[PDB]
Amino acid sequence: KVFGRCELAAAMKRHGLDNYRGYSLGNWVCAAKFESNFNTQATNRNTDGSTDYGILQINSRWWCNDGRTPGSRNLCNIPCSALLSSDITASVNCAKKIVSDGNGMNAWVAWRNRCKGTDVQAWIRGCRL
Ligand code: NA
């Protein structure tokens, strides 16, 4: 599923991401935009052999099991394929654990490099929220 901007904002708000750990909703929409272009089926491989999955590009090195990342962890207790679903529940629940791990949204390289320090509220302008 490729989400619309306001569609994703509403779904993220319904799942409790608005101001979660102090990050306003525009931060999450901005992160999703530059991580996956709003596409739940996005995958990208990392140099160490791990893979990032779904709309928030969650990494198999720590957070999910994809059967091909030896020596890694599965801290969200999910198969990585679950993160590619049109239902974003698994991605949002896992993202809540990531952002709570001490580094905040700096865990997402695209957020730090393309969202942090910008007017992130622009990403929800015009939406009925
Ligand atoms: Na893993």
Curated annotation (Swiss-Prot):
Entry keyword annotation includes Secreted: yes
Pfam families in alphabetical order: Lys
Active site: 35, 52
Subcellular location, principal: secreted
Binding site for substrate: 101
Keywords, in A-Z order: Allergen, Antimicrobial, Bacteriolytic enzyme, Disulfide bond, Glycosidase, Hydrolase, Secreted, Signal
Protein EC: 3.2.1.17
Cysteine pairings via disulfide bonds: 6-127, 30-115, 64-80, 76-94
Annotated InterPro entries: Glyco_hydro_22 (IPR001916), Glyco_hydro_22_CS (IPR019799), Glyco_hydro_22_lys (IPR000974), Lysozyme-like_dom_sf (IPR023346)
Source superkingdom: Eukaryota
GO molecular function: beta-N-acetylglucosaminidase activity; identical protein binding; lysozyme activity
Subcellular localization, as worded in the UniProt entry: Secreted
Assembly mode: Monomer.
PANTHER family on file: LYSOZYME C
Its job: Lysozymes have primarily a bacteriolytic function; those in tissues and body fluids are associated with the monocyte-macrophage system and enhance the activity of immunoagents. Has bacteriolytic activity against M.luteus.
Family: Belongs to the glycosyl hydrolase 22 family.
Listed name of the protein: Lysozyme C
Lineage: Eukaryota, Metazoa, Chordata, Craniata, Vertebrata
